[PDB]
Amino acid sequence: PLESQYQVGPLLGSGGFGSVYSGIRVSDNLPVAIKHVEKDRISDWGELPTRVPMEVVLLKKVSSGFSGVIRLLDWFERPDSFVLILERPEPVQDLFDFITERGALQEELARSFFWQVLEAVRHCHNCGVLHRDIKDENILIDLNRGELKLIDFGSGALLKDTVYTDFDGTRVYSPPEWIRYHRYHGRSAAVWSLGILLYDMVCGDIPFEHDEEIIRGQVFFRQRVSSECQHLIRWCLALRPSDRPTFEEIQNHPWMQDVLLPQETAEIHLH
Ligand SMILES: Clc1ccc2c(c1)N(CCC[C@@H]1CCCNC1)c1ccccc1O2
């Protein structure tokens, strides 16, 4: 019934995540995204009360209620692929393209965006999900509402308190303990990736490209950035996992005070 229930539109993008198309739910005209993944390229499987990709398990765990995560609406199995039906904000732009187009973000805008990402990541952790690929390309902006939404749980895992020794996320957002030892814990690795993201936001590019820079952990600013924002970044990017802030500590940091709500953010910065 997939073919009769959704009208397929243009291809939005393709990559390690598969191929994603614009779609409309025929029942009520709801904008959707339709994501196809070949079965042979699914390395990571889990189970429902049947055998599904882990991405479906993780999405179901985070798609209850409202959150800053793009929600799984339905899924289908085909003989050689799985098809996922996801929310699609309209109009929308991913944060990578937004930053590529507009350059380094004003701190007020970065503060609003970063705050929303923190809230979304807390939501995932609350639901027992570790994203493991937090980055600009996995954040969508609802341009009218100023609301950010996390995508792509394809490298994610169940959250646990023991060590992870596997990683299939983005290397330049990966922490020094992974580079050096192939070992990390969930929350502290997530905080590292958040430091990279925040730098990316306020500087318009990522801080490290090579392994040696990651391991050295020295952050240089190319752009004028406030002392308070530089401090938070350097704290998230502490070389020792135990020296990094908790999410609570990030959200109580001086730089994170007086965040704009999403709608005000869109009025000032996006309209
Ligand atoms: Cl609109 C929209 C809804 C839901 C989406 C996704 C997009 N995408 C992203 C599609 C590729 C981007 C589109 C914009 C230009 N840059 C490339 C996605 C990518 C990977 C997993 C889930 C996803 O779920």
Side-chain angles (χ1 to χ4, degrees), residues 1-46 49-271:
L2 163 60
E3 293 82 350
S4 42
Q5 210 179 330
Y6 296 99
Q7 195 201 75
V8 187
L11 181 78
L12 300 177
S14 75
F17 53 88
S19 297
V20 176
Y21 297 79
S22 190
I24 311 290
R25 195 159 59 187
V26 304
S27 73
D28 61 346
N29 302 297
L30 184 76
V32 297
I34 299 166
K35 182 160 88 64
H36 295 80
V37 200
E38 288 168 12
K39 287 183 175 168
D40 321 89
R41 296 190 299 93
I42 304 180
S43 65
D44 212 319
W45 299 81
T50 343
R51 176 185 180 73
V52 293
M54 192 60 95
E55 183 179 20
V56 173
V57 174
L58 299 180
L59 284 162
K60 287 173 91 64
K61 286 167 67 59
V62 301
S63 296
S64 281
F66 302 122
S67 69
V69 182
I70 267 153
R71 294 211 264 172
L72 181 66
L73 298 173
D74 204 359
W75 63 274
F76 299 86
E77 185 172 3
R78 280 175 159 176
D80 295 284
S81 63
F82 279 90
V83 184
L84 273 53
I85 309 295
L86 303 155
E87 294 184 296
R88 174 165 67 77
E90 171 42 49
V92 69
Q93 189 176 36
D94 72 46
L95 182 61
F96 176 87
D97 290 340
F98 182 92
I99 290 166
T100 298
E101 285 187 6
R102 298 196 164 179
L105 279 32
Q106 278 169 228
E107 282 185 40
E108 182 184 72
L109 183 55
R111 175 181 305 111
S112 171
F113 278 13
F114 193 61
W115 182 270
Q116 295 185 238
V117 175
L118 281 150
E119 290 286 324
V121 171
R122 287 176 57 201
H123 176 259
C124 289
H125 285 27
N126 259 276
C127 296
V129 178
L130 190 68
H131 188 284
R132 303 203 290 184
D133 202 23
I134 299 163
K135 59 173 176 178
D136 54 5
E137 298 170 70
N138 289 332
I139 296 160
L140 297 184
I141 309 158
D142 175 332
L143 272 342
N144 282 343
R145 293 183 177 284
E147 297 178 356
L148 269 58
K149 301 225 164 281
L150 266 49
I151 56 166
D152 198 352
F153 289 82
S155 312
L158 297 172
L159 187 53
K160 67 196 196 175
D161 294 305
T162 50
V163 69
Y164 290 91
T165 58
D166 68 290
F167 176 77
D168 206 292
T170 306
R171 193 164 182 87
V172 293
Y173 286 77
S174 80
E177 64 271 23
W178 167 254
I179 301 311
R180 293 178 54 75
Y181 307 121
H182 290 73
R183 296 170 65 81
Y184 60 98
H185 289 75
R187 295 177 191 89
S188 55
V191 166
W192 175 274
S193 78
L194 291 165
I196 302 297
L197 177 67
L198 178 52
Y199 185 97
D200 185 58
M201 285 184 193
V202 297
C203 292
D205 216 333
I206 55 163
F208 312 127
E209 205 182 61
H210 308 298
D211 288 4
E212 316 84 62
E213 303 183 284
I214 293 168
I215 288 161
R216 185 157 183 257
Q218 284 195 222
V219 183
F220 293 103
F221 290 84
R222 56 188 98 228
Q223 198 76 10
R224 161 63 195 204
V225 173
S226 70
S227 303
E228 280 180 342
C229 185
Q230 288 190 20
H231 184 276
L232 180 55
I233 290 171
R234 283 186 173 105
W235 194 15
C236 294
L237 299 181
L239 284 180
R240 293 164 70 229
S242 70
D243 290 336
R244 297 179 197 146
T246 63
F247 299 141
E248 179 175 19
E249 284 176 316
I250 293 169
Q251 293 194 289
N252 290 327
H253 190 277
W255 192 73
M256 294 257 68
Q257 304 311 293
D258 309 292
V259 70
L260 297 177
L261 290 173
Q263 210 75 240
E264 311 179 85
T265 308
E267 287 165 355
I268 299 171
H269 297 280
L270 306 175
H271 301 346

